[PDB]
Every structure is written in C-alpha cells, then in structure tokens.
Amino acid sequence: PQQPQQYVIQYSASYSQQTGPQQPQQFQG
Amino acid sequence: PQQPQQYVIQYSASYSQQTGPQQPQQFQG
Amino acid sequence: PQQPQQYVIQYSASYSQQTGPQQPQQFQG
Amino acid sequence: PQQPQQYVIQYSASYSQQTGPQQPQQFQG
Amino acid sequence: PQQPQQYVIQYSASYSQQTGPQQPQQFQG
Amino acid sequence: PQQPQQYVIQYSASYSQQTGPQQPQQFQG
Amino acid sequence: PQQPQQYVIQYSASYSQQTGPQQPQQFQG
Amino acid sequence: PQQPQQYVIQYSASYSQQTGPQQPQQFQG
Amino acid sequence: PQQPQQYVIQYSASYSQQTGPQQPQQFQG
Amino acid sequence: PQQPQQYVIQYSASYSQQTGPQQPQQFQG
C-alpha cells in the first residue's frame, strides 16, 4: 500500500500576488 | 495498491492574482 | 490496482484573476 | 485494473477571470 | 479493464469569464 | 474492455461568458 | 504502508508577494 | 509504517516579500 | 514506526523580506 | 519509535531582512 502525497499550494489575498511557476515532479517505480 | 496523489492548487481573493503557469509531471511505472 | 490521481485547480473570487496556463502530464506504463 | 485520474478545473466568481489555456496530456500504454 | 479518466472543466458566475481554449489530448494504445 | 473517458465541459451563469474554443483529441489504437 | 508527505506552501496578504518558483521532487522506489 | 514529513512554508504580510525559490528533495527507498 | 520531521519556515512582516532559497534534503532508507 | 525533529526558522519584522539560504540535511537509516 504505497501512497505518496505531495501538496503544492499558492494563495494570496488583499492586494497580493504570486509570480513563480509550479513545476513539481513525483516519481514512483 | 498504488495510489500516488499530487495536489497543485492556486487561488486568490480580494484584488489578487497569480501569474505562474502550472506544469506538474507524474511518472508511474 | 493502479490509481494515480493528479489535481490541477485554479480559482479566484472578488476582483481576482489567474494568467498562467495549465499543462499537466501524466505517464502510466 | 488501471484507472488514471486527471482533474483540470478552472472557475471564478464575483468579477474574476482566467486567461490561461488548458492543455493536459495523458499517456497510457 | 483500462479506464483512463480526464476531466477538463471551466465555469464561472456573477460577472466572470474564461478566455483560454480547451485542448486536451488522451493517448491509449 | 477498453473504455477511455474524456469530459470537456464549459458552463456559466449570471452575466458570465466563455470565449475559448473546444478542441479535444482522443486517440485509441 | 509507506506514506511520505511533502508540503510546499506559499501565501501572502496585505500588499505582499512571492517571486520564487516551486520545484519539489519526491522519489519513492 | 514509514511516514517522513517535510514542511516547506513561506509567508509574508504587511508590505513584505519572499524572493528565494523552493526546491526540496525527499528520498525514500 | 519511523517519523522524521523537518520544518523549514520563512516569514516576515512590516516592510521585511527574505532572499535566500529553501533547499532541504531528507534521506530515509 | 524514532522521531528526529529538526526546526529551521527565519523571520524578521519592522524593516529587517534575512539573506542566507536554508540548506538542512537529515539522515535516518
């Protein structure tokens, strides 16, 4: 029972911003 | 029973923004 | 029983926006 | 029993928008 | 029993919009 | 028993719109 | 029962921003 | 029962920012 | 029951910033 | 029951900054 869990989360509020891209890599096997 | 879980989430509220693209890669096998 | 799960989610409210494209790649086999 | 699941979701409310295109690729076999 | 599932969903409410096109590609075999 | 399932859905309500075209490609064989 | 958990989280409020990209790598197997 | 837990968190408020990228690597096996 | 826990946290408020990147490595096995 | 705990924390307020990167290494096994 293999269950790898990867959470990549970006959020912002009240006159904010995020510029960077999201590039995650998950390798099983 | 192999269940890899990848969560890529972007959200924003109240005069906010996100610019970066979402490019995730999942490899099984 | 192989069940890879990939979640790519963008949302925004109250005068917000998202500019980046969504380009996910899932490889099984 | 192979069941790969890919969820690409964009939504917005209350004077919001999404500009990026949706281009997901799923490879089985 | 091979059942790949790809969900591409865009929706918006209350003075919102989505501009990007939907171009998903699914390859089996 | 091969059953690939591709869902491309656009909807909007309450003074909303969607501009992008829908161009999905499904390849079996 | 192997369950590796990786949390990558960026958020900001009240006239703030984040510039760096998110590039995490998870290797199981 | 192996459960490695890695938390990478960046946040900022009230006219602040973070510039560095997030590049964590987790190796199990 | 092996549970290694690594916490990498950067935050700042009231006209502050952080420049350095986050590059943690966790090795189990 | 092995539980190694490593805390790497940088924060600053009121016209302050941190420049150095965060590169911690945890080895179990």
Added chain:
Amino acid sequence: PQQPQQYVIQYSASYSQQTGPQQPQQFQG
C-alpha cells in the same frame, strides 16, 4: 524512544539583518 531535537533559529527586528546561511546536519542511525 529516540527523539533528538535540533533548533536553528534566526530573527531580527527594527532595522536589522542576518547574512549567514543555515546548514545543519542531523545524523541518526
């Protein structure tokens, strides 16, 4: 029941700064 605890903390306020990087190493086993 082995619980090694390592705390690496940098903070500053009121027109201050920290330049040095954080590179801690924890070896169990």
Added chain:
Amino acid sequence: PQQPQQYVIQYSASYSQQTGPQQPQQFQG
C-alpha cells in the same frame, strides 16, 4: 529514552546584524 537538545539561536535588534553562518552537527547512534 534519549533526548539530546541543541539550541542554536541568533537574533538582533535596533540597527544590528549577524554575519556568521550556522553549521551545527548532532550525532546520535
């Protein structure tokens, strides 16, 4: 019940700074 505790702390206020890096090593086993 082995609990080694190592505290490495740098802080400064009111027009101060710290230049040296933090490189602690903890060996158990």
Added chain:
Amino acid sequence: PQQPQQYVIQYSASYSQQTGPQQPQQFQG
C-alpha cells in the same frame, strides 16, 4: 533518561554586531 543540553546563543542591540560563525558538535552514543 539521558538529556544533554547545549545552548549556543548570539544576540546584539543598539548598533552592534557578531561576526563569528556557530559550529557546535554534540556526540551521544
């Protein structure tokens, strides 16, 4: 019940500074 405790602390205020690095080593076992 073995609990070795090592405290390495540098701080400064009102136009002060610390230059030396922090390199403590703790050996148990």
Added chain:
Amino acid sequence: PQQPQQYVIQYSASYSQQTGPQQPQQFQG
C-alpha cells in the same frame, strides 16, 4: 538521570562587537 548543561553565550550593546567563533564540543557516552 544524566543532564549535562553547557551554556555558550555572546552578546553586546551600544556600539560593540564580538569577532570570535563559537565551537563547543559535548561528549556523552
């Protein structure tokens, strides 16, 4: 019940400084 306690502390105020590095070694066992 073995509890060795080592305190290494450097501080300075009002136009002062400390140059020497901190390199303490604690051996138990």
Added chain:
Amino acid sequence: PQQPQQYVIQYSASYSQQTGPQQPQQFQG
C-alpha cells in the same frame, strides 16, 4: 543524578569588543 554545569559568557558594552574564540569541551562518561 549527575548535572555538570559549564558557563562560558562573553559580553561588552559602550564601544567595546571581544576577539577570542569560545572552544569549551565537556566530557561525561
């Protein structure tokens, strides 16, 4: 109940400084 206590303290104020390094060694066992 063995509790060896070693205090190494350097401080200075009002246009002062300390140059020498701190290298204490504590051996129990």
Added chain:
Amino acid sequence: PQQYVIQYSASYSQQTGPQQPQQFQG
C-alpha cells in the same frame, strides 16, 4: 419551494458523470 438534485450509486456500481446543476429561486 424545494429543489432536489440527487445522485445515488447503489452497491457494487459505478457512476462516472459529473454533477453540476444550476438552481435559481426567486
């Protein structure tokens, strides 16, 4: 005024269709 949208999957069955209704009252 009552509006009911119900999707019910009985035992040993599979339902794949998404559920996305629009309900306007008043």
Added chain:
Amino acid sequence: PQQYVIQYSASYSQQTGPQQPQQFQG
C-alpha cells in the same frame, strides 16, 4: 426556500464525478 444537492455513494461502490453546483437564492 430550500435547495438540496446530494451525492450519495452506497457501500462497495465508486463515484468519480465532481460536485460543482451553482445556487442563487434571492
């Protein structure tokens, strides 16, 4: 005025469709 959207998965069953309703009252 009551609006009910209910997705119910019985025992030994699988439901894959997302749940995304839009409800406007008044």
Added chain:
Amino acid sequence: PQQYVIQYSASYSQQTGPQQPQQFQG
C-alpha cells in the same frame, strides 16, 4: 433561506470527485 451541499461516502466506498460549490444568497 437554506442551501445544503452534502457529499456522503457510505461504508467500504470511494468518492474521488472534488467538492466546489458556489452559493449566492441575497
């Protein structure tokens, strides 16, 4: 005015669809 969105997974079952409703009252 009451709006209910309920996702219920019975015993020995799997639900995979996300829950993302939009509710506007007044």
Added chain:
Amino acid sequence: PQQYVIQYSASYSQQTGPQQPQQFQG
C-alpha cells in the same frame, strides 16, 4: 440565511476530493 457545505466520510471509506466552496452572503 444559512449555508451548509458538509463532506462526510463514513466508516471504512476513502474520500479524495478537495473541499473548496465559495459562499457570498449579502
């Protein structure tokens, strides 16, 4: 004015979908 979003996982079951509702009152 009451808005309820409820995700309930019964015994020996798995729910994987995220919960991300948007609620506007007044």
Added chain:
Amino acid sequence: PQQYVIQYSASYSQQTGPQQPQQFQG
C-alpha cells in the same frame, strides 16, 4: 447570517482532500 463548512472523518476512514473555503459576509 451563518456560514458552515464542515469536514467530518468517521472512524476507520481516510480523508485526503484539502479544506480551502472562501467566505464573504457583507
């Protein structure tokens, strides 16, 4: 005006979805 977002995991069950709601009152 009351807004309730509730995620409830019953006994011997697993919930993996994140909880990230947006609530605007007035």
Added chain:
Amino acid sequence: PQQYVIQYSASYSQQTGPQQPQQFQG
C-alpha cells in the same frame, strides 16, 4: 455574523488535507 470552519477527525481515523480558509467580514 458568524463564520465557522471546522475540521473534525473521529477516532481511529486520518485526515491529511491542510486547513487554509479565507474569511472576509465587513
């Protein structure tokens, strides 16, 4: 005006999703 975000893990259960709500009142 009351906003409630509640994550409840019953006995012998595991919840993995993060809790990150945004609440705007007035």
Added chain:
Amino acid sequence: PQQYVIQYSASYSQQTGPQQPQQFQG
C-alpha cells in the same frame, strides 16, 4: 462579528494538515 477556525483531533487519531487561515474584519 465572530470568526471561528477550529481543528479538532479526536482520540486515537492523526491530523497532519497545517492550519493557516486568513481573517479580515473591518
């Protein structure tokens, strides 16, 4: 005006998700 974010772990259970809410009043 009351905003409540509550994370509750019952007996013999594990909660792993971080708690990071943003609350704006007035």
Added chain:
Amino acid sequence: PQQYVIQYSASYSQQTGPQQPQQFQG
C-alpha cells in the same frame, strides 16, 4: 469583533500541522 483560531488535540492523539494564522482587525 472576536477572532478565534483553536487547535485542540484530544487524548491519545497526534497533531503535526503548524499553526500560522494571519488576523487583521481594523
């Protein structure tokens, strides 16, 4: 104006998520 962030770990349970809320009043 009252804002409550509460993390409660019941008996024989483990909570691992950090607590890092941002609260703005006035």
Added chain:
Amino acid sequence: PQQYVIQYSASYSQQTGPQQPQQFQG
C-alpha cells in the same frame, strides 16, 4: 477588539506544529 490564538494539548497527546501567528490591530 479581541484576537485569540490557542493551542491546547490534552492529556497523553503530542503536538509538534510550531505556533507563529501574525496579529495586526489598528
């Protein structure tokens, strides 16, 4: 104007998450 951040560990339990809130009043 009252802001409460409370971390409570009941008997025979372990809490590992750090407590680092940011509170702005006026």
Added chain:
Amino acid sequence: PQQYVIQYSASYSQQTGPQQPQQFQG
C-alpha cells in the same frame, strides 16, 4: 484592544513547537 497567544500543555503531554508570534498594535 487585547491580543492573546496561549500555549497550554495538559497533564502527561508533550508540546514541541516553538512559540514565536508577531503582534502589532497601533
């Protein structure tokens, strides 16, 4: 204007997270 950050460890329990809040009043 009152800001309360409270970390409470009940009997026969362990709390490991650091306490590092930032409080700005006026």
Added chain:
Amino acid sequence: PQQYVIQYSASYSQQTGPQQPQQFQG
C-alpha cells in the same frame, strides 16, 4: 492596549519550544 504571550506547562508535562515573541505598541 494589552498584549499577552503565555506559555503554561501543566503538571507532569514537558514543553520544549522556545518562547521568542516580537511586540510593537505605538
């Protein structure tokens, strides 16, 4: 204007986290 940071260790308990708050008034 009152700011309270309180760390309380009940009987037969262990608290390991450091206490390092930053408080700005006026």
Added chain:
Amino acid sequence: PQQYVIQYSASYSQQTGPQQPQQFQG
C-alpha cells in the same frame, strides 16, 4: 500600554525553551 510575557512551569513539570522576547513601546 502593557506588555506581558509570562512563562509558567507547573508542579512536577519541565520547561526547556529559552525566553527571549523583543518589546518596543513608543
């Protein structure tokens, strides 16, 4: 203007974290 940092160790308990607050008034 009152700022209180209090570390309290009850009977038969151990507190190991250092106390190092920064307080700026006016």
Added chain:
Amino acid sequence: PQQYVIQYSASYSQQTGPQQPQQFQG
C-alpha cells in the same frame, strides 16, 4: 508604559531556558 517579563518555576519543577529579553521604551 509598563513592560513585564516574568519567569516563574512552581514547586517541584525545573526550568532550564535562559532569560534574555530586549526592552526599548521611548
């Protein structure tokens, strides 16, 4: 303008953390 840093060790207890606060008034 009053600033209070208090470390209190109750009966049959041990406190090991150093006390090193920085207080700036005016």
Added chain:
Amino acid sequence: PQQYVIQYSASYSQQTGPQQPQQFQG
C-alpha cells in the same frame, strides 16, 4: 516608564537559565 524583569524560583524547585536582559529607556 517602568521595566520589570523578574525570575522567581518557588519552593523545592531548580532554575538554571542565566538572567541577562538589555533595557533601553530614552
């Protein structure tokens, strides 16, 4: 303008941390 740093060891207790505060008034 009053600044108080107080270390108090109750009966049958041990305090090991040094006391080294920095106080700037005017």
Added chain:
Amino acid sequence: PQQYVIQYSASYSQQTGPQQPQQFQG
C-alpha cells in the same frame, strides 16, 4: 524612569544562573 531586575530564590530552592543585565537610561 525606573528599571528593576530582580532574582528571587524562594525557600528550599536553588538558582544557578548568573545575573548580568545592561541598563541604559538617557
């Protein structure tokens, strides 16, 4: 302008930490 550094050892107790404060007035 009053600055108080007080170390108080109650009956049948041991205090080992040195007392070394720095006080700047005017």
